[PDB]
Amino acid sequence: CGYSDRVRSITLGNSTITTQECANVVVGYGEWPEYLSDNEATAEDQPTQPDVATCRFYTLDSVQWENGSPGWWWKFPDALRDMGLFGQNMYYHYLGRAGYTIHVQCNASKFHQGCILVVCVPEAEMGSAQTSGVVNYEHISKGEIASRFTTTTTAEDHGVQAAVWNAGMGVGVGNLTIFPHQWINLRTNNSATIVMPYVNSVPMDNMYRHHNFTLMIIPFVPLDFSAGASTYVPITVTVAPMCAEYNGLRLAGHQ
Amino acid sequence: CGYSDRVRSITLGNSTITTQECANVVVGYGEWPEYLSDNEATAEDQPTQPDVATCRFYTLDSVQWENGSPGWWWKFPDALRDMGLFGQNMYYHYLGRAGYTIHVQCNASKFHQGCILVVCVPEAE
Amino acid sequence: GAQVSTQKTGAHETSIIHYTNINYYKDAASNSANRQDFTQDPGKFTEPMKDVMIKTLPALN
Amino acid sequence: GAQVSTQKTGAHETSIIHYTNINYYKDAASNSANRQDFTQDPGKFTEPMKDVMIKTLPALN
Amino acid sequence: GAQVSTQKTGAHETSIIHYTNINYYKDAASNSANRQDFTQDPGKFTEPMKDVMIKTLPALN
Amino acid sequence: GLPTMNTPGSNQFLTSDDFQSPSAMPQFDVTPEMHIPGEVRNLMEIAEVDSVMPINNDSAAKVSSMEAYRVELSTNTNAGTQVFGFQLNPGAESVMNRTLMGEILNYYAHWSGSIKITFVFCGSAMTTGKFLLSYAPPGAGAPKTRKDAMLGTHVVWDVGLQSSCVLCIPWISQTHYRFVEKDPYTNAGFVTCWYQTSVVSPASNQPKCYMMCMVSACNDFSVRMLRDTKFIEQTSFYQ
Amino acid sequence: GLPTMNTPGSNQFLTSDDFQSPSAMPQFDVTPEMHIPGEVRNLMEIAEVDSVMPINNDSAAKVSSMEAYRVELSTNTNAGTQVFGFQLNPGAESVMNRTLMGEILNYYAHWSGSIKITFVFCGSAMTTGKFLLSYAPPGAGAPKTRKDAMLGTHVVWDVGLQSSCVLCIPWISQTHYRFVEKDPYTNAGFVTCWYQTSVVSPASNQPKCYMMCMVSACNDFSVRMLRDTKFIEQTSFYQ
Amino acid sequence: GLPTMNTPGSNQFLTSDDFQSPSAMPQFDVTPEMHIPGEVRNLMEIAEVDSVMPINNDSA
Amino acid sequence: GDVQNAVEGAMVRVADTVQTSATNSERVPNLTAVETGHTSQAVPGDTMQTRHVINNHVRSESTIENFLARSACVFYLEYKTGTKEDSNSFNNWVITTRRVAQLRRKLEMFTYLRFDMEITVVITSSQDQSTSQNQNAPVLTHQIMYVPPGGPIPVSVDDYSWQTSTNPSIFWTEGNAPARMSIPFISIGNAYSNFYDGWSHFSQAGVYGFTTLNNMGQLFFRHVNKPNPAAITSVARIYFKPKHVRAWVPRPPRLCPYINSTNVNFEPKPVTEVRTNIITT
Amino acid sequence: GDVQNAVEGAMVRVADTVQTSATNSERVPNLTAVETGHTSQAVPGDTMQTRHVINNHVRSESTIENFLARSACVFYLEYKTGTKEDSNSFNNWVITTRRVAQLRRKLEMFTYLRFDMEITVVITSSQDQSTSQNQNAPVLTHQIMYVPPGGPIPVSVDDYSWQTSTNPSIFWTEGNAPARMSIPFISIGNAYSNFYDGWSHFSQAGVYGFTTLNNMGQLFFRHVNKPNPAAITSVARIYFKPKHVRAWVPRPPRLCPYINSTNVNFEPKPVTEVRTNIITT
Ligand SMILES: CCCCCCCCCCCCCCCC(=O)O
Numbered sequence A: 001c002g003y004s005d006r007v008r009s010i011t012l013g014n015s016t017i018t019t020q021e022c023a024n025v026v027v028g029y030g031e032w033p034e035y036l037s038d039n040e041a042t043a044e045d046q047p048t049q050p051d052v053a054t055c056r057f058y059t060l061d062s063v064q065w066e067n068g069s070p071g072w073w074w075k076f077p078d079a080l081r082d083m084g085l086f087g088q089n090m091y092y093h094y095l096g097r098a099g100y101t102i103h104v105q106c107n108a109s110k111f112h113q114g115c116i117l118v119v120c121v122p123e124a125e126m127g128s129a130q131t132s133g134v135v136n137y138e139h140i141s142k143g144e145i146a147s148r149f150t151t152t153t154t155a156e157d158h159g160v161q162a163a164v165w166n167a168g169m170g171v172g173v174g175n176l177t178i179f180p181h182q183w184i185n186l187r188t189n190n191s192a193t194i195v196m197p198y199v200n201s202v203p204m205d206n207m208y209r210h211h212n213f214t215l216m217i218i219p220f221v222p223l224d225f226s227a228g229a230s231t232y233v234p235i236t237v238t239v240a241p242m243c244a245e246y247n248g249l250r251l252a253g254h255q
Numbered sequence B: 001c002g003y004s005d006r007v008r009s010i011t012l013g014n015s016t017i018t019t020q021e022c023a024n025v026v027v028g029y030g031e032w033p034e035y036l037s038d039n040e041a042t043a044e045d046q047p048t049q050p051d052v053a054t055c056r057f058y059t060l061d062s063v064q065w066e067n068g069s070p071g072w073w074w075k076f077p078d079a080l081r082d083m084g085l086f087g088q089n090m091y092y093h094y095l096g097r098a099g100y101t102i103h104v105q106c107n108a109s110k111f112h113q114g115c116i117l118v119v120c121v122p123e124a125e
Numbered sequence C, D, E: 001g002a003q004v005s006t007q008k009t010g011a012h013e014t015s016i017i018h019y020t021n022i023n024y025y026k027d028a029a030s031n032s033a034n035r036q037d038f039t040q041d042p043g044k045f046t047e048p049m050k051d052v053m054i055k056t057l058p059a060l061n
Numbered sequence F, G: 001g002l003p004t005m006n007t008p009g010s011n012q013f014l015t016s017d018d019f020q021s022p023s024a025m026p027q028f029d030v031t032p033e034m035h036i037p038g039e040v041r042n043l044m045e046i047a048e049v050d051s052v053m054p055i056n057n058d059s060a061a062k063v064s065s066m067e068a069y070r071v072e073l074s075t076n077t078n079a080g081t082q083v084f085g086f087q088l089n090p091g092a093e094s095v096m097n098r099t100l101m102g103e104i105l106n107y108y109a110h111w112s113g114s115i116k117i118t119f120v121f122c123g124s125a126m127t128t129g130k131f132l133l134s135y136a137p138p139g140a141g142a143p144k145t146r147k148d149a150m151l152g153t154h155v156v157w158d159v160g161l162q163s164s165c166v167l168c169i170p171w172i173s174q175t176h177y178r179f180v181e182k183d184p185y186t187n188a189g190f191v192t193c194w195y196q197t198s199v200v201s202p203a204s205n206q207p208k209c210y211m212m213c214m215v216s217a218c219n220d221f222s223v224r225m226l227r228d229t230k231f232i233e234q235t236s237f238y239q
Numbered sequence H: 001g002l003p004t005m006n007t008p009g010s011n012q013f014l015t016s017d018d019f020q021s022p023s024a025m026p027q028f029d030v031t032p033e034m035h036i037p038g039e040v041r042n043l044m045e046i047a048e049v050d051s052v053m054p055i056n057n058d059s060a
Numbered sequence I, J: 001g002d003v004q005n006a007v008e009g010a011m012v013r014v015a016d017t018v019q020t021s022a023t024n025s026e027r028v029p030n031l032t033a034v035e036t037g038h039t040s041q042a043v044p045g046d047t048m049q050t051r052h053v054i055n056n057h058v059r060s061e062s063t064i065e066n067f068l069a070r071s072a073c074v075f076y077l078e079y080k081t082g083t084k085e086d087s088n089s090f091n092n093w094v095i096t097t098r099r100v101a102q103l104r105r106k107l108e109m110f111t112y113l114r115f116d117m118e119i120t121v122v123i124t125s126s127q128d129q130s131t132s133q134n135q136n137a138p139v140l141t142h143q144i145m146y147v148p149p150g151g152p153i154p155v156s157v158d159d160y161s162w163q164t165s166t167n168p169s170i171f172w173t174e175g176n177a178p179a180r181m182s183i184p185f186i187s188i189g190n191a192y193s194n195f196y197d198g199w200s201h202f203s204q205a206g207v208y209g210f211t212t213l214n215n216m217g218q219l220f221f222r223h224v225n226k227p228n229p230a231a232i233t234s235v236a237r238i239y240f241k242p243k244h245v246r247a248w249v250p251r252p253p254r255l256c257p258y259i260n261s262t263n264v265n266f267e268p269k270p271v272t273e274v275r276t277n278i279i280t281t
């Protein structure tokens, strides 16, 4: 052969990401996403399937990894609400269903060290900083801008409890690995690819109310390097919807 | 294939050494060690063979390589006289026979240089 | 229409004892707990890979 | 003289469990409620017509 | 699936009466005590010898 | 008619019983099943997944932070220096107590099986080193020198392109099951880690780096005697 | 003899049980059956029949009279004017609350199926008009203009010789069953009616006329979880 | 349903009885048997072994 | 096969250990790359010389069924024997499973859970002190009535509601074996959801969390008897047993204590207990 | 065959006596050498002329099963009806079989013993004297909870522990047939060990004796009812019956009285009772 297993090319729609350092690709729970069958249909109206127009790699915002930084999370599908025709279809349709290819990108030279956990947590319900309080929307998501974790227990009013070590939901962070995960350990690979299929208890759902899963990026070993060897290393999260289909068409709105 | 010839795993007894950089393995004079035959026996009494209990990797002391240092030697089987049940069997028995896997370990980064000869001299008077 | 099935029993030095069960109700909900079924499949969690990994070969090559 | 019949059970991903019933009394009145029988016929109420009406054709023509 | 077996009864002047047992539980532990089994073998205790000793011959000869 | 007598054990509610009982809604129509990816059907499937151990655990300060998980290695350390040590006894030893395997274990009083600790080196990509991973069976106390450790079951991990080497700790026990609870009668020996050579680095690079340790249950493992956990309690009903 | 033990659930009367029990008159001779036209054997047969909705419902005055049933249309009304609107949620929405379908529904906690609203124009025989019948799915509030309504599922009824056009409202729901009781989690969207053109009349004829709206359950419909109604009560035994 | 009456001897615990009774741990996994030399299965096997008599017995 | 057919079983046993010998091969079975998200499949025979062992151990108390199917106490409720003027003569409980700590923690290990349930209820009575506390009273019957969502609600101990023309009720006299019912599956979804991350309103507002989905009606409890010349207090302890369970998507166990039963709020706790040093015997 | 299959049996009978006649042979069947450690196999026909006799006697009450399988009292425990302020409102018992003299002596005749067990428990209540001892009270339910090794322990009559989410419990109302459970085999060894000669610590120290191996959890007992206006004392008598027994290595019966239940300590007693003379009619 002439193949290496460190090079991979994922082409989806009119968008191709290449990577020359990676370690395999994790297919969430062994199952590849696919369209709803006629044995699991509930809706009677004919679905639209926009295929190529709504499946393609949407590059979301990229935050800078620093030595002191504690971690970041984004909530899907909520994050994609301003991304092109995905956003539009989601805005004009009551019900939506789709899987997603999450591809986290980062890189560094040989004289850097540091290791990030990349994990897709389905159904992450989160606490509240004030334990008599109740969290509200704006502290759960900022859309496509990353929500930061904190390493200080105290937080504002309607703050979400986000002390790193309890993952913001009252479970020891070290056990998060039970959900589909990879690690970008700088020295080996430099990207993660998790193909997350649709997991929900009901066949399709409303894209605004429900948040299917949260992408958490937590640095377990801090970024470090010796003096004068670059100081800016961003982390870019690129995500592509797969097999997106929508039922129930009506006027645009939230309420 | 998926094999590389730079990775090697030697498992013997309850002891495994792995190495991810090596160049082959020299089998002394082309012959692999094995038990004494019944054509070359002289002793009449039944031998004991402790197998797994006395075959396994004994890590001896490690010296530091420095710029000025001139070299080191160890004498076998004499060196192994305090190593576990090998030592004990050797202490309670008049006659012994055994072959040996010698594995010298060292490492450095890319910005070091230096080259050591590793040689097993039989009968060095 | 009775059903016959084998009871849990340990190993023995170098067997089968049956019991009888009959359902008396019209709804499957009323049936006894299904405590015998030991099937499992770690696969989905322990190796959620796309490309098969052979144990003896290096993981990345 | 026992009677065997199938219990109500839902659908499954792409079965039959029986139960046994025996009557112990001499009067049919004493028997259990007949809860299984799902037959129906809307016809008598929904279309009490003399002339058949075809859905696709105009009602009056 | 019933099991039939013979009851303990004494001797008679110059027989067999059966009883029926059915298990109702899924664990062998729940079964009735095994009170019928009269097998024995004194051998291990009464003669733990290496060389066989014949009764009629002298013990040491 | 048919006669018939009661026996001891009539009219008593037993928690672990299993009997048929009448339905409360006759002929209810259950909602049809669908798929749903990812189905457990046996807790051992969970136990076989790798959790990360918080070995570093010396003081409250680091225990309420991410520090807990990263074991500090340093360059220019003499060979035969102990990196860490703790006695193996999952579900009663603090190190593995609250990991995935540990949490599952604490619902049972008996365990059996083999454990596999995967050591991953998360240092620099230009740094090198070799470590001796030792597991000493019990009955002689923990090793105190590299030589003592060497006599026990050990793997020498040479760090390289493959980041992680797994120490498979085999089951060697008199009995078929040990207690989950700490007991003097059954102990599981001592797992220790030692510098086989030293960590060497090039010119401009950080001197200190970190390793991390994963723990999971091997493919032969089992648990018996189901019981309540001690890690949760209340003093009144939640509201 | 035969022994035998009781289990939990002995000597307790359960309302929904089903057991055999001795007769009170042995060998009673039941009166022989005859025919009797019209036999229901399933409540859905009733639910499929068309009841008339009281849409007009603005004040007590008209609600205690025949006025309630007739929706007033008028000539010379600008196109794109809303005739009426209400959110769909049978058995908790006042409009369909006490109709045949509604009454049946209020004995159940879960419904599923498709509803069909038959609009009949009871105007003059010389008057004409076209109406847009819209059904908007939920998740964006009720439409506020003809344009908003147009984007939803709609039928344009042209009145003519055939008096009535039926708006079949299809089942589009996440779940297989909705609650009969009002709940924020499940909503069924908004049904609105609009003038597509206008009502035009000839010379000597009345300007104002009326339409009436029938409602019934389609051929796929079902109900689960039987429960008491809230539309009847007493404070003592009747005499 | 099926009717059925009690007889004298209902709801009384007899020491030497023998009935089935529910388990307290469903599907417990018993530890597998091994050998173990020397197995009695009947007390007479013990009685057949020679003990030594203390015939001399005249005083404390 | 079917998990409501309980006489159909299956059998499997724990894997054996095959004997191995010393090697000096070019294959590494204990080197792997954690980064992949792949758990190593090393077995003892790969790094030791092992003997041949046969295992007859069987995983059998770690099946989901066997694990969850034991009757847990979910709540107890108290009510006196009174009149219509009392407001403690009857009582009610909104059905939820989040009140107790123990059972809650068990359930929350799975995201989606589908099961049938056996509900058993132990009602215990006690004499209240009074001047006339040596008054004679005969046996007391108790009525447990299930009211499904959106049904009539009792406003007193005695009103029309208690007629129960289509509401399931149990009348249980004291000195009998505890009352027991089986309930089928009852969701409007395809599984019970122990976690819901989402809002009740499409405008991203209202109620956050699991509360939004749960809705299961209520149990109303009363005494059937007319009052005696002194009050008797009764306390009903409700037991739930999940049978025929199927579970999807495992989650990490809870670490922090619960605070509320309507949300997942917590205050951060230490990861694990401190130990003396990094080297410990 | 299998000792858990109780319908499978076997049959054997006691040996017959065959007729013999006078001899003047050269064979001695009644001379033997005790030194050998061999028990003589002499039968009556070897030293008398016997007639032919047929025996139909059968050893059938000296089978191990029949011998051990009768329900023995192992312990009784006492507890009053109280509040949380009382420290006698509940009670507990650490499971052991060494408390009673009779059953202990029976078991100790075999070194290793393997069996399943039927546990029956008879709870009896009595009215305590008080000023208000003619107070009325309804029937009392009792709860027996088994706590396996290393589980939560009650600190009061009322705390979370009693929820019993995976601990086996029996709720038993008075005036019913005694509560009964069957327990499988439960050791971590291959048989229960009635004697252990050895130490808990490898340095030849700590605990000497059987104590080291025994560890079986505890039974916690309480009243479920709220207190009445006077205390009621209850005493639970625990009965054990070993069924499906298999026994290995017979030992001499005990001679000296027991003193402790954690060790085999004794003080020496006379071998057998004195008699008047070496010749006695
Ligand atoms: C007297 C009749 C009583 C009928 C009682 C009906 C009780 C319904 C029980 C619903 C149990 C729901 C379990 C939810 C589990 C969860 O998601 O946490």
Ligand SMILES: CCCCCCCCCCCCCCCC(=O)O
Residues within 6 Å of the ligand: H024, J095, J097, J107, J117, J119, J144, J145, J146, J168, J169, J170, J181, J183, J186, J192, J193, J194, J216
């Ligand atoms: C309410 C549930 C009660 C469950 C009780 C479990 C009791 C375990 C009994 C263990 C008996 C051990 C016999 C040991 C015999 C011996 O070696 O002396």
